[PDB]
Amino acid sequence: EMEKEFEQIDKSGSWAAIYQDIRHEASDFPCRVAKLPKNKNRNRYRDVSPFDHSRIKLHQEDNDYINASLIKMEEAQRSYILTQGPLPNTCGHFWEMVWEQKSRGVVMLNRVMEKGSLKCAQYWPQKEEKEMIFEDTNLKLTLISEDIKSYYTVRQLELENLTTQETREILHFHYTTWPDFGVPESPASFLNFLFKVNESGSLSPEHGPVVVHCSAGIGRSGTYCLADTCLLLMDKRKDPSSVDIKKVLLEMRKFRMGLIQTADQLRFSYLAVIEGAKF
Ligand SMILES: O=C(O)C(=O)Nc1sc2c(c1C(=O)O)CCNC2
Ligand SMILES: [Cl-]
Ligand SMILES: [Cl-]
Ligand SMILES: [Cl-]
Ligand SMILES: [Cl-]
- In three-state form (DSSP H/G/I as H, E/B as E, the rest C), the secondary structure along the chain is CHHHHHHHHHHHCCHHHHHHHHHHHCCCCCCCCCCCHHHHHHCCCCCCCCCCCCEEECCCCCCCEEEEEEEEECCCCEEEEEECCCCCCCHHHHHHHHHHHCCCEEEECCCCEECCEECCCCCCCCCCCCCEEECCCCEEEEEEEEEECCCEEEEEEEEEECCCCCEEEEEEEEECCCCCCCCCCCHHHHHHHHHHHHHCCCCCCCCCCEEEECCCCCHHHHHHHHHHHHHHHHCCCCCHHHCCHHHHHHHHCCCCCCCCCCHHHHHHHHHHHHHHHHC
Domain coordinates of the chain in residue numbers? 1-279
Ligand 4 centroid – CA 241 distance (Å):
38
Task: Report phi then psi at 106, rounded to 5.
Answer: -125, 125
User: Which of 2, 54, 60 is closest to 256 using CA atoms?
Assistant: 54
Name the nearest CA neighbour of 67 among 99, 35, 37, 29: 35
In testing the pocket of ligand 1, which one of 44, 48, 178 has its CB within 8 Å of the most ligand atoms?
48
Binding site for substrate: residue ranges? 180, 214-220, 261
Amino acid identity at 201: G
Which residues are catalytic, by number? 214
CA–CA separation, 135 and 142 (whole Å):
14
Ligand number nearest CA of 36 is 2
Give the whole-angstrom CA distance, residue 177 versus residue 152.
7
On whether the CB atoms of residues 140 and 163 are closer than 8 A, the answer is no
Residue at 132: amino acid letter:
M
Angstrom distance (rounded) from CA 80 to CA 78: 7
Experimental technique of record: X-ray
State which ligand 1 atom lies nearest to the alpha carbon of 219.
Answer: 5
Instruction: Count CB-CB contacts under 10 A for residue 205.
Output: 7
> What Å resolution does this PDB entry report?
1.5
177 contacts 199 by C-beta, under 8 angstroms: no
Name the phi and psi angles at 95, rounded to 5. Answer: -75, -30
Q: For residue 274, which of 185, 188, 147 has the smallest C-alpha distance?
A: 188
Maximum CA extent, the chain: 60
Please return the burial class of 102, using the count of CB atoms within 10 Å of its CB with bins 0-12, 13-18 and 19+.
Answer: exposed
Number of the ligand 1 atom closest to the C-alpha atom of 214: 1
